Amino acid sequence: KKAGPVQVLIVKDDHSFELDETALNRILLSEAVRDKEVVAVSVAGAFRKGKSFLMDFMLRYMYNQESVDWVGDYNEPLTGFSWRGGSERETTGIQIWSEIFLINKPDGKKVAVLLMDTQGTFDSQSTLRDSATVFALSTMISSIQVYNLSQNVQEDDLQHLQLFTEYGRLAMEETFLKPFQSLIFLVRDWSFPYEFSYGADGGAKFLEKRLKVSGNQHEELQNVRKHIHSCFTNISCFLLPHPGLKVATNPNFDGKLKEIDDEFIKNLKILIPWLLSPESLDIKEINGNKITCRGLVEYFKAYIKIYQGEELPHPKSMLQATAEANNLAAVATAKDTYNKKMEEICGGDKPFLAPNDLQTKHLQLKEESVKLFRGVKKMGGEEFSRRNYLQQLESEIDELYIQYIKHNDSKNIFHAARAAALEHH
Amino acid sequence: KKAGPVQVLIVKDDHSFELDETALNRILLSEAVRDKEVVAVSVAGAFRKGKSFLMDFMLRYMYNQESVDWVGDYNEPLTGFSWRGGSERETTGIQIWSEIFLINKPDGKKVAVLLMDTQGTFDSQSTLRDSATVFALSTMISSIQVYNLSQNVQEDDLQHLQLFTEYGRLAMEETFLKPFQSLIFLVRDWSFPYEFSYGADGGAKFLEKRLKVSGNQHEELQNVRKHIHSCFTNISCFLLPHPGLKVATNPNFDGKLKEIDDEFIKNLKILIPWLLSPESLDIKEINGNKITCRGLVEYFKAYIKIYQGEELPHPKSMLQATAEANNLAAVATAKDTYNKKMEEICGGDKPFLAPNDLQTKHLQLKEESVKLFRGVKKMGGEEFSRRNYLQQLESEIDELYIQYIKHNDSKNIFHAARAAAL
Ligand SMILES: Nc1nc2c(ncn2[C@@H]2O[C@H](COP(=O)(O)OP(=O)(O)O)[C@@H](O)[C@H]2O)c(=O)[nH]1
Ligand SMILES: Nc1nc2c(ncn2[C@@H]2O[C@H](COP(=O)(O)OP(=O)(O)O)[C@@H](O)[C@H]2O)c(=O)[nH]1
Ligand code: ALF
Ligand code: ALF
Ligand SMILES: [Mg+2]
Ligand SMILES: [Mg+2]
DSSP states (O other), X not given: OOOOEEEEEXXXXXXXXXXXXXXXXXXXXXXXXXXXXXXXXXXXXXXXXXHHHHHHHHHHHHHHXXXXXXXXXXTOOOOSSOXXXXXXXXXXXXEEESSOEEEEOTTSOEEEXXXXXXXXXXXXXXXXXXXXXXXXXXXXXXXXXXXXXXXXXXXXXXHHHHHHHHHHHTTSOOOXXXXXXXXXXXXXXXXXXXXXXXXXXXXXXXXXXXXXXXXXXXXXXXXXXXXXXXXXEEEEEEEOOOOOHHHHHOTTOOSOGGGSXXXXXXXXXXXXXXXXXXXXXXXXXXXXXXXXXXXXXXXXXXXXXXXXXXXXXXXXXXXXXXHHHHHHHHHHHHHHHHXXXXXXXXXXXXXXXXXXXXXXXXXXXXXXXXXXXXXXXXXXXXXXXXXXXXHHHHHHHHHHHHHHHHHHHHTOTTHXXXXXXXXXX | OOOOEEEEEEEOTTSOEEEOXXXXXXXHSSTTTTTSBEEEEEEEEBTTSSHHHHHHHHHHHHHHTTSTTTTOOTTOOXXXXXXXXXXXXXXXXXXXXXXXEEEEOTTSOEEXXXXXXXXXXXOTTOOHHHHXXXXXXXXXXXXEEEEEEESSOOHHHHHHHHHHHHHHHHTSOOOSSOSEEXXXXXXXXXXXXXXXXXXXXXHHXXXXXXXXXXXXXXXXXXXXXXXXXXXEEEEEEEEOOOOOHHHHHOXXXXXXXXXXXXXXXXXXXXXXXXXHSTTTOOOOEETTEEOBHXXXXXXXXXXXXXXXXXXXXXXXXXXHHHHHHXXXXXXXXXXXXXXXXXXXXXXXXXXXXXXXXXXXXXXXXXXHHXXXXXXXXXXXXXXXXXXXXXXXXXXXXXXXXXXXXXXXXXXXXXXXXXXXXX
């Protein structure tokens, strides 16, 4: 059996997740690797952006780093993880390479290298939770996360990175250390080498500016950068040239280097050993402990079990989350107002109210609190409120009303009995 | 007296917005155009994606429409709205062309055409509110919005469009009609003509598949699409080839067609008249009324005034907004828990409680509700909860306690004169 890609995290059609433990155990629990300290390299980011393609050049280096020309014969097609053109996603879930690479580090340590390829985020078959779970899991498992971006590092990219890494952090053991190790902002099709050079040095200068935290920036900009810095012990950036229009657009392209732009190739041959050379391979650490292949299986099972449950808050889009916050805040105000107004008429220090007098004032105050809730301008507007929050508000007000019923009754328990006795009299 | 770009929506370093009303009035209130029905064409989308570059080719068409060679001499630099390479944003706010084009529609109606160029969203200096205000205002003002995207239409693109259009709808008057008119998904650097042909027909098939609502689709995917369809009376899509690496990467490139990929040019010459030909020009309508240039000016002013205040909720990042929702929900659960636990000992059907016992049970139940609040897993971290919600929750529980003191005291009454009489 030849080495090949192995699907380990499956996303089902109903957006539930399954770990193929058998497949994962077969690769990571073999006698040759299971007790080896593990290096886990992942690539993640927006879909359809060359992630699998890049990983297959990483495989070439992993297999041929001892040869003079690891990058390959210029007529050799690019194989391994499945990659292709087209606007529909190819990789789903998380796949790993079936052959764990045993690599000697300069300090004599023999480490196991795992390569992890991921479903691109934001394809139109996936919920936000699907995309967040894949990104979070790949970040939580990897010791090197290659965050693959197109053309630029935009503010929505940083917000997505923040959301996905937060989602990962929420599923992890509490720790005083940073949750993750190495992040690489890999910018595909960097177009401004005259501004910042292709490679890791122009990348570092670009990203140093782009991620810099200033106490004088708007807190929204500050906090996304603070978050990202807090998550990773090392953050780097590599700017890659466009690979040429043949790579991007020719359907007959199959990965041959003779059809890839030369400056892309030069930088690819710098990028890959920079990421993967024996010196650069950071052993995976979780909660301050170096992890073996066997222990990584355990964390993969632990982490996925959390995401298969419902302990964590659901990832929400900007509009959904803001609409919910807007509605939650207005429900609280409307209910608080109903409470305070009811206290004015049937608080503990107020006289007993006849039941239909209490009912009249409750119905009026309930209506006033519903009109107040409805009047608050909220994202998603009236339709989202009515379907998801109005019934909750009216129901909770009703509950408060029944409490006030009992409070009020307590002040004159014989009201109805005495009334009936007196009506006869 | 040369036409040029005019900054009308000014964005300041403090993230405030200013309308240059003098400049806007000078352009759209002149005698020749003030009473004409207006067509407003905007381009909007992520920053650094060639929006101003595109609009400058729109300018060439708008001036040289009658000519077969409107695209220009192949040695002519591209001028108009400022465009350039570099990773840092150039256009800010909203600028318009100072010359309003007068066009005869096929039915003989003469309309005024306004061209709007916008600050790309998500640049490194902008809050989400900044980006949403620009995108929403340009959508609310334009009758044709070219949503300029790079390479593909991704689900986050649809979510951004939903957020920005929702933010626009929030500032508009209630209506029984769709709020906006024409939207064009312009996919720059479309790389898969073997899957969907370059141009409008390939774009239509591609976008139809992207925006289709299906019954078996997760409702989160359904809902963003239903929103987008509910917002626009016409949604189309154009797939544009990459312009060539020189356009993308050469710092001396200045817009000469001779340095632009011929297949890009071929589709560009189809795109611009497809967008801007007299038949294509959609007269701006707001809530079912066609708008004039003078009417459009008032809406510029009215809409920005709404965004300049705080009547509306602010757009927030996914994490910020989720953290707030998570904490608001946990606060409500904590207080609701305290309420129901207090009802078990001081509800109307419970006996009078000695004040010291009530205090002790309050203190315990408050602490339980605070522990509940703090233990609930939330986005944003424990410090966000502690700094922004914990003390208010404790204070609100303290207020509820006082209500319960009064309910409890009502159960221990003694009237000395009544007792001595009894
Ligand atoms: N524009 C561009 N295209 C690339 C690059 N690298 C690979 N491609 C092309 O991008 C497409 C998607 O590749 P793939 O690895 O399957 O993307 P993935 O979905 O992110 O894994 C293929 O057609 C590749 O030839 C790049 O750096 N820039
Ligand atoms: N890749 C690519 N670059 C383009 C395209 N159109 C223009 N450009 C380049 O994009 C860069 C930014 O253009 P500009 O109009 O200032 O972008 P804007 O910020 O969206 O207004 C310039 O270097 C243009 O030469 C396109 O279709 N594809
Ligand atoms: F679109 Al992909 F791996 F991100 F096929
Ligand atoms: F980056 Al821009 F106009 F969107 F300069
Ligand atoms: Mg892939
Ligand atoms: Mg611009």
